[PDB]
């Protein structure tokens, strides 16, 4: 009976993500928010033969109604990358979008789980946390930077190389969601896979630049939308299952962390009724992986500080 | 091991449809075709952690490679309606789209199931049949006008009025997919439901005008996309399940028919390995429903004739 | 110093039309209406260094304010053709667009000049007249079907074949704005030009199908936008000049006519203070041109009737 | 008699820009380039009754033929801003677009006037100059960063505040084309205008933020298009008049400069037959304006080095 709000529901990620949420038996209310086209999207989705009651909200003054009583808020809202761009090129747009939307959450559903998809996640999660702090409703266990697409890609690519079914493969991916901050722990993969170093390096790079590959392939028509909707759905389903009492629910996510010198970090998380039940940490890693962690730290801390300073100067 | 082709995979219906197909363990090869954007849509979907091999195809030259060895072809391609349009207003443009694509189907995958979403279905299915006849590969058991969205809508509206879970409501809808040719058999609904006659007439009008309601609500930005993808995906899944020998799979679909004086007509169909296992027919209906059947036949015959005559001139 | 309203200012025709009107010293006030994007379009245009005051209006609630005190209303609003479509395929959409917008003109600026670009013009002008008759403010001297693009095309194609400067070529085109109802009076061309009948026939058919040529060239991205904006601007400028007292201003336009048995017809019109100052008629024509007039009359009457019938069913 | 090329002719700026150029008796040949839609845009424009011959070009193979013999090349190509972005945020996409297109210009029309609209102009002109240096054909009197829209805005806003005819207002705007680098010299306005301080300050800021105000007004649907087309056309016309021997033609533009320590800077330029006849420099300015020049220099230098560093890493 979860009520889930989707902020940015009319966008490229928003529309398919809303479809996947509408199709789920875990959702009973699905409220949709955007600044255009939301009523047509809700009308469209409300015809689908599932129990979730759908409502489309349009414009800032309707945002409180969309958020009230929400258990989960997903935020796919944001401008997508075009060819050549870094995710940080979209910092200024998406930071103001994330700060505005998360401020509305802090006021109107402070208790809800906040799942941020909007990039750069390495900065937008710090932004979300600081905004909740300013409203005095800060709960580190309920703020999630959705990195699930990195895990999803890692599983697919390992499966392809080893001729496995991607559904049966699980690769923990830690760090953050940008370039070399994306650290796939192939040493912790289930099933165990043995790659020689040249293939491991090629596989790791592929995972790290996978978003850029899609941007390139779309040749100006944006970034990952459909696979991001899949990954976004997956994480929200994991979270809702855990909120309903399902045990042993583990997902990697970029959260307020105590695992490294970074105040924010993605690790495997045991999920439960109050969000993060336990941070499972990095665990045992190879020299290759340890070296990637070390090299990721400066960029992560820089991205965190940029997110923090953006909010603190509002 | 279903090899599925989606013709029009980059459109508003095509993209979320391809996503849902990619998410299913029934599909092992997903080939996507359009005149633009397909490599990007394919790159996007190829990252999802399911077994389906995704491949994008672009331009008439690559159409035969997209269709090579396909078991099923779904055709979401077509110009969508704007407010104040009938589906028949799109006949002229969509008829030549369908005739071109179905011709390629008859040349390169004549044995495949052909699932036409492209509207107006009442005319475009006849076009498909005639095109297949011109290539001498006509199988009436394998050509389906996807009307599933009318059933999905009927199920949802009945469920909302009776306070039921729409996932366990089943309303047969017969006739065709246009205005008063859409005939919901509320009398055959399971579980059994009873409305006062005035409420029945309102429910029935709503179901008939449901497509238009979404068009109006989208205010010029096209017609149903997400619900149409859900409905198209459900039909393909039903069909593919039956092809794997699943029993008791029933879907309404606009097909070659000997149930009325209309050469094509939609009724509940038992699906099997060959395609249509058995047309389950119209069955016992109310006087109200029999009145609607009688009223619809003129329009259907005109739509069928229109489609047949179009193929005459090629 | 005319106040000019553009209804459908955000569309493909409307934006560049609005630009050309904004650039003209004949326009002191420019009001822009649409259902989306108008505020942005007006903000954009308001930065241009000309005297015209620009204001954007969004949605029906702001439509009366847009029309208040207008001297001219230009109506580029309307759905454009795609490959394979006829202009009549768009009758249903554009007929209800024109009916809604002209009804607002009748109520809020009944004395304004009404310039309809919305196709098919052969029907939408009858619709406009009947809608104005319903409101009891019908003035047939102020209602114009914009056929100017036909004249502009004929001038260009004649000039290209004869190696002339198009600016010095004037070709009267009479009849209507669709297919074989478009009748270029090459015998009345200035300067005088001689063509062999096979060339004349080719030239004539080129003019008649010139819109279809552009729709083909755009391959799904719509119909003439930029050349139509030029033609609409030219007609509005001619009309406004004439309203300011300029003498000898002649433009062909589809209007209430008694030049033939067709109740509406396009001929050269002397424009002036009251709009249509004088209908100059068909004049002297060749036997070839005479044949075309006769061949065209049946389609014109059908299109006129079709438009009148549509208004009665409201 | 001028031959003008437009690179990016299918975009929001390109199309209305192409229309304005086609409408001008100064243009005898108009060549249009883009990676999509150019044949349709060209077909559309070719119907207009002006002497300019219009040809559409499509794909890398045809770019050289678009450019050969050109007197002027205008480059509106590029991704536009969305609300909350700086122009600098688009650097990583538009840098490689400008690099590629200006390399083609240096190869196929090195003696043409190169007019870069593509933003951020403060960085993309340095790119253009470095690309021309690599090809050994760098002429600083023929490369122009198009800042004309800033002047057009300044003229309009000044005219609105004082109740003047904007056609009679000419405000010099110096520096560059981004936020605080845009420096309107109101002290040098003709006619001479006196503003109280609070209006002067609000006027100056309005001019500096004018781009963002249009982006905000468009609510995600891009940046200025129609006014940018106007401004780009005006600049091309000024250049062409000067090439035709007209005296006293002065335009501000961002060019190679020795006015400040910035290697590129915008000042009023006397234009001649070979492009820049004479840089008229900053001249006498107020203390308020001198401060704005001081404040602008650090940002310009960083934007300049960024453009230079981009080319050095190819």
PDB file of C-alpha atoms in Angstrom, chain B residues 3 7 21 23 33 38 55 112 142 168 181 185 189 213 236 243-244 274 276 281 287 300 304 308:
ATOM      1  CA  UNK B   3      12.875 -13.678 -31.413  1.00  0.00           C
ATOM      2  CA  UNK B   7       8.822  -1.948 -36.076  1.00  0.00           C
ATOM      3  CA  UNK B  21       9.719  -6.780 -23.933  1.00  0.00           C
ATOM      4  CA  UNK B  23      12.354  -7.068 -19.231  1.00  0.00           C
ATOM      5  CA  UNK B  33      13.513  -0.948 -36.270  1.00  0.00           C
ATOM      6  CA  UNK B  38      17.116   2.986 -32.947  1.00  0.00           C
ATOM      7  CA  UNK B  55      19.942  -4.921 -31.732  1.00  0.00           C
ATOM      8  CA  UNK B 112       6.094 -14.993 -37.935  1.00  0.00           C
ATOM      9  CA  UNK B 142      -1.036 -15.456 -37.544  1.00  0.00           C
ATOM     10  CA  UNK B 168      -8.577  -9.981 -11.470  1.00  0.00           C
ATOM     11  CA  UNK B 181     -17.160  -0.493 -33.124  1.00  0.00           C
ATOM     12  CA  UNK B 185     -19.457  -7.347 -23.215  1.00  0.00           C
ATOM     13  CA  UNK B 189     -17.471 -10.028 -17.347  1.00  0.00           C
ATOM     14  CA  UNK B 213     -10.012  11.084 -23.476  1.00  0.00           C
ATOM     15  CA  UNK B 236       2.798 -10.364 -27.141  1.00  0.00           C
ATOM     16  CA  UNK B 243       3.758 -20.555 -28.567  1.00  0.00           C
ATOM     17  CA  UNK B 244       5.742 -22.221 -25.745  1.00  0.00           C
ATOM     18  CA  UNK B 274       0.079 -22.230 -34.411  1.00  0.00           C
ATOM     19  CA  UNK B 276      -5.056 -18.793 -33.268  1.00  0.00           C
ATOM     20  CA  UNK B 281     -16.660 -16.400 -30.907  1.00  0.00           C
ATOM     21  CA  UNK B 287     -30.088  -7.246 -26.194  1.00  0.00           C
ATOM     22  CA  UNK B 300     -16.432  -2.057 -39.826  1.00  0.00           C
ATOM     23  CA  UNK B 304     -12.315  -3.185 -44.123  1.00  0.00           C
ATOM     24  CA  UNK B 308      -8.614  -3.786 -49.114  1.00  0.00           C
TER      25      UNK B 308
END
